[PDB]
Structure formats: structure tokens, C-alpha cells
């Protein structure tokens, strides 16, 4: 029997913690001998979980396509993904039109007001003693970022949500369709208001823009609304999530990091290590050979980052959340000409959320009466992380 036969990434068992990390650690232990194997799911694919083999793969732009990013595709009608979606030549014209945006000194330039925001959203609950970290902290605090962002009311995180929902994990079709398309005509709205009152967002800085002399179409506006929403809110949350759901626990990490707040970043890389979200498609475009299989035109790749994060070969002790972990060159915000743009932003959203949460509730743990929740699929992640803690007092009132 093979573990790689029925492997699924949103369907990964899970063990009695709660997350898929029994069923990871597994699937690493038998990539040693197997480092890419075939999956029955989803028709028939490749899944990669060696990390010299998805680095062989990610650096093959000749061979391996973004056009397979998302695998089963994600529902965004009949919009490309902008960038994530895209190959050179073309990928690399619309990623350099927002690379300054999202540069480490733009993106330093919110520290302080992630820093006022999270402490805000502390003290809607703090005097209350639960709440649930995923949807009062984590769902929130990269949601409010990313509407500042697009120029959207931060106070609608839950119509974004929803919106994400229908791309990536609605069942029916038809419905699926029908609420991404409530995103667009959103997004259309924006973008007619933006043209007329344009701001320093960057919305406005797309509709500006120009590639060989053209101004971009309203569908590659539609475009990058829907992928920086989708990357900002989404992906941070589930992992935001997974890092609150790990502390609850885990006192011997969270007593360190309360201790050596100078270690916090650091900490940070390691949790992306080990929570990292996301895994990548690529669609196979030339007949190629990695290790002992060969890929065919039209076959899908699966990139299986977490085994990778979990190789023997690449990381010493790579089961333990080793905070002091460098150079730590894991895999989970990609690697090459598709390495996440929001790789700064997500850092500091990470350093800030842990450092004032661990500040203002240094001592909390997961309600025994609730249940937690792991949501599986390409961006994975605790969904429902109930916490309870003595109750403590608010800054502002
Ligand atoms: C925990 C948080 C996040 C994780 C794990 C993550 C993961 C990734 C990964 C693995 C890729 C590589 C895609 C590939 O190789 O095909 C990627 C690309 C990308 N991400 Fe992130 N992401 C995160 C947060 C963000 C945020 C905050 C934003 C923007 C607000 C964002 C926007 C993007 C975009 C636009 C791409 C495509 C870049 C390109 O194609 O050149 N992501 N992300
Ligand atoms: C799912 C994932 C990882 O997030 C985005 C923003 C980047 C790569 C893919 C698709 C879209």
C-alpha cells in the first residue's frame, strides 16, 4: 500500500490533535523511498513531496505551468488568476506593476497601525474570557489590512469571506459561480468609483498603470481585486489561526516566546514552516523527468510544500518547532518567479498579532466544551480555535 494512491489535499486525515501533521509526517517517511508518487484523486495526478523535487519542479517554468496553480481550479468564473495564474513573459509585466506596494518599506509603513488594530480587536473580548481566536483575532486582522489595501469598508470582512468561501470550497457549481460573481460585480463598482477618485491603494495604482502603452481592461482589474483579496485574506487567516490554535496548547513554546519577544520573527519562520497553508498546482506543458517519473503533456502536478517543510534531507529534526531554526529555507511561501508577493506583509502581520496577543492574554487555553476545527483544501489551516482565559481589561474604555 501507498500512501500517495489516495492522497487528496482536501481530504487529509486527520489524527487525534486535529490537524493532518500524523498523516504528513507519514507521507514524508514514505517519500524517502517514493519522492513523487500518483494520486487517483481528482482523475489522476502527480503529487511532489520530496523538497529537492518540488524544487526541481518550481524552477521549471519550461515544463511545469502556472495555468495549474489551483487544482481542482478554483471558481473565478471565467477570470484568470492575475499573476499566481500566469507564465512568463506576461506574469512578470503584471506582478512588477504592485511590487512596490508590497516591498518590506511600504508594507512597514501599517506596523503600528496592525499594532492599534489588534489590540482594538483584543478588547471587544478581553473582558469576557472566550472567544474563538480564529474568527475574533485571526479572520479579522488580515482582513481589515487587506480592505485598507483595495479601498474596501474593513468593516465587511464577512462579505469577503464569503466571497472567498464560493472560490474555493463551495460544492455547487452553480452556486459557487453565482457568489464569485457577486465579487465581481463588487469589484466593478470599485473600480468605477477608484477611476473617478483615485487614491494611493492599490486599486488605483493598477488602474493607472500601464503595460506596452495600454491601460490594463476592467477584467485585469477585476483580476487583481480578486487575487489580492484572495491572497490577503485568506491564506494569512488559516495560518494566523493554526499559529493562536498551537499557542493555546502549547506552553512551553508560548512561555519562550513571552520570555524572548526578540525571537518572534524568527518563531514566525518556523510556524510558516511547520502551518505553512498552502500547496500549488502546476500543469505539465513538455514531456519531462524528475527523479524516476517521467510527466506528461497535460498532467498536474501537485506540490505537497508541508512534506517538503518535513524532509530529512533539508532540515535537521524536522518534527520539532525549532524557534531558533536558520537558515530555514522552507517551502511554504514557494519559491522562484511565483514566491509569494505578500511574503513581508504576512511576517509582520504574524510578529504583530503574536506579540500583542501574548501581551495582553498571556495565559489562555482551548475550551474544553467547544470544538476546534481544521479546514483542509490547497490553503489549509484551523478554522474554530474556542479559547478561554482569565478576564482581563480593555485599553481603550
Ligand atoms: C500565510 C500567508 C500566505 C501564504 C502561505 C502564501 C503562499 C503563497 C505561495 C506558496 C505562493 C507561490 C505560488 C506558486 O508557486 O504558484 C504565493 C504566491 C502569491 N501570493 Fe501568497 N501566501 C500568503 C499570503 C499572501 C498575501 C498576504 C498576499 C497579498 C496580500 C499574497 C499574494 C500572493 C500573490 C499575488 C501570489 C502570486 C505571485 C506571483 O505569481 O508572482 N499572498 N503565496
Ligand atoms: C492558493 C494559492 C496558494 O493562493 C494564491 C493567492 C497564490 C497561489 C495559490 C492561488 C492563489
Redesign the pocket.
Given at each position: 500500500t501507498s500512501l500517495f494512491t489516495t492522497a487528496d489535499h482536501y481530504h487529509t486525515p486527520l489524527g487525534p490533535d486535529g490537524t493532518p501533521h500524523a498523516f504528513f509526517e507519514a507521507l514524508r517517511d514514505e517519500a524517502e523511498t517514493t519522492p513523487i508518487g500518483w494520486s487517483e484523486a481528482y482523475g489522476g495526478h502527480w503529487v511532489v513531496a520530496g523538497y529537492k523535487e518540488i524544487q526541481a519542479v518550481?524552477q521549471n517554468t519550461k515544463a511545469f505551468s502556472?495555468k495549474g496553480?489551483t487544482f481542482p481550479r478554483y471558481e473565478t468564473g471565467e477570470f484568470e488568476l492575475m499573476?499566481?495564474g500566469?507564465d512568463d513573459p506576461v506574469?512578470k509585466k503584471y506582478?512588477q506593476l504592485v511590487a512596490k506596494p508590497?516591498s518590506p518599506e511600504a508594507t512597514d509603513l501599517f506596523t503600528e497601525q496592525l499594532r492599534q488594530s489588534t489590540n482594538d480587536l483584543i478588547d471587544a473580548r478581553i473582558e469576557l474570557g472566550e472567544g474563538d481566536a480564529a474568527t475574533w483575532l485571526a479572520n479579522e486582522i488580515?482582513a481589515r489590512l487587506?480592505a485598507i489595501?483595495l479601498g474596501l469598508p474593513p468593516e465587511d470582512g464577512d462579505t469577503y469571506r464569503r466571497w472567498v468561501w464560493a472560490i474555493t470550497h463551495v460544492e455547487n457549481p452553480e452556486e459557487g459561480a453565482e457568489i464569485f460573481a457577486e465579487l465581481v460585480a463588487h469589484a466593478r463598482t470599485l473600480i468605477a468609483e477608484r477611476r473617478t477618485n483615485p487614491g494611493n491603494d492599490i486599486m488605483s495604482r493598477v488602474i493607472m498603470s500601464k503595460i506596452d502603452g495600454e491601460s490594463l481592461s476592467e477584467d485585469d482589474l477585476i483580476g487583481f481585486f480578486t487575487?489580492?483579496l484572495l491572497?490577503?485574506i485568506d491564506?494569512?487567516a488559516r495560518?494566523l489561526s493554526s499559529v493562536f490554535w498551537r499557542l493555546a496548547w502549547d506552553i512551553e513554546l508560548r512561555r519562550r516566546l513571552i520570555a524572548h519577544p526578540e525571537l518572534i520573527p524568527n518563531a514566525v519562520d518556523e510556524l510558516?514552516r511547520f502551518y505553512?497553508?498552502?500547496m500549488?498546482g502546476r500543469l505539465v506543458t513538455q514531456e519531462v523527468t524528475v527523479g524516476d517519473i517521467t510527466m506528461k503533456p497535460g498532467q498536474t502536478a501537485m506540490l505537497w510544500?508541508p512534506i517538503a517543510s518535513r524532509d530529512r534531507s533539508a532540515f535537521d529534526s524536522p518534527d520539532n518547532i525549532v524557534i531558533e531554526r536558520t537558515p530555514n529555507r522552507h517551502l511554504?511561501?514557494?519559491h522562484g518567479?511565483?514566491?509569494?508577493?505578500?511574503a513581508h506583509?504576512?511576517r509582520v502581520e504574524a510578529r504583530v498579532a503574536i506579540t500583542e496577543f501574548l501581551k495582553r492574554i498571556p495565559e489562555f487555553s482551548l475550551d474544553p466544551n467547544k470544538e476546534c476545527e481544521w479546514l483542509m483544501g490547497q490553503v489549509a489551516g484551523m478554522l474554530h480555535v474556542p479559547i478561554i482565559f482569565p478576564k482581563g481589561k480593555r485599553l481603550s474604555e
Amino acid at each position: 500500500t501507498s500512501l500517495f494512491t489516495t492522497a487528496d489535499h482536501y481530504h487529509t486525515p486527520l489524527g487525534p490533535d486535529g490537524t493532518p501533521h500524523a498523516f504528513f509526517e507519514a507521507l514524508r517517511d514514505e517519500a524517502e523511498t517514493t519522492p513523487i508518487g500518483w494520486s487517483e484523486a481528482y482523475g489522476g495526478h502527480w503529487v511532489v513531496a520530496g523538497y529537492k523535487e518540488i524544487q526541481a519542479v518550481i524552477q521549471n517554468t519550461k515544463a511545469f505551468s502556472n495555468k495549474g496553480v489551483t487544482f481542482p481550479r478554483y471558481e473565478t468564473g471565467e477570470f484568470e488568476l492575475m499573476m499566481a495564474g500566469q507564465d512568463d513573459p506576461v506574469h512578470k509585466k503584471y506582478r512588477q506593476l504592485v511590487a512596490k506596494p508590497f516591498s518590506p518599506e511600504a508594507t512597514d509603513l501599517f506596523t503600528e497601525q496592525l499594532r492599534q488594530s489588534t489590540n482594538d480587536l483584543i478588547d471587544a473580548r478581553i473582558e469576557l474570557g472566550e472567544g474563538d481566536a480564529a474568527t475574533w483575532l485571526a479572520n479579522e486582522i488580515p482582513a481589515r489590512l487587506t480592505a485598507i489595501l483595495l479601498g474596501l469598508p474593513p468593516e465587511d470582512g464577512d462579505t469577503y469571506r464569503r466571497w472567498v468561501w464560493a472560490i474555493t470550497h463551495v460544492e455547487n457549481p452553480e452556486e459557487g459561480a453565482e457568489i464569485f460573481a457577486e465579487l465581481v460585480a463588487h469589484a466593478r463598482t470599485l473600480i468605477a468609483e477608484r477611476r473617478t477618485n483615485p487614491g494611493n491603494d492599490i486599486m488605483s495604482r493598477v488602474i493607472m498603470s500601464k503595460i506596452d502603452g495600454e491601460s490594463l481592461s476592467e477584467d485585469d482589474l477585476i483580476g487583481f481585486f480578486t487575487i489580492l483579496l484572495l491572497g490577503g485574506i485568506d491564506a494569512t487567516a488559516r495560518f494566523l489561526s493554526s499559529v493562536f490554535w498551537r499557542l493555546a496548547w502549547d506552553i512551553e513554546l508560548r512561555r519562550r516566546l513571552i520570555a524572548h519577544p526578540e525571537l518572534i520573527p524568527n518563531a514566525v519562520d518556523e510556524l510558516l514552516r511547520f502551518y505553512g497553508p498552502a500547496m500549488v498546482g502546476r500543469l505539465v506543458t513538455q514531456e519531462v523527468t524528475v527523479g524516476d517519473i517521467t510527466m506528461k503533456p497535460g498532467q498536474t502536478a501537485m506540490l505537497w510544500f508541508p512534506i517538503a517543510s518535513r524532509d530529512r534531507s533539508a532540515f535537521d529534526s524536522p518534527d520539532n518547532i525549532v524557534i531558533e531554526r536558520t537558515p530555514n529555507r522552507h517551502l511554504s511561501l514557494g519559491h522562484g518567479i511565483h514566491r509569494c508577493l505578500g511574503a513581508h506583509l504576512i511576517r509582520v502581520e504574524a510578529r504583530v498579532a503574536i506579540t500583542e496577543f501574548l501581551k495582553r492574554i498571556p495565559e489562555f487555553s482551548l475550551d474544553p466544551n467547544k470544538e476546534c476545527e481544521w479546514l483542509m483544501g490547497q490553503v489549509a489551516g484551523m478554522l474554530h480555535v474556542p479559547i478561554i482565559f482569565p478576564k482581563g481589561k480593555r485599553l481603550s474604555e
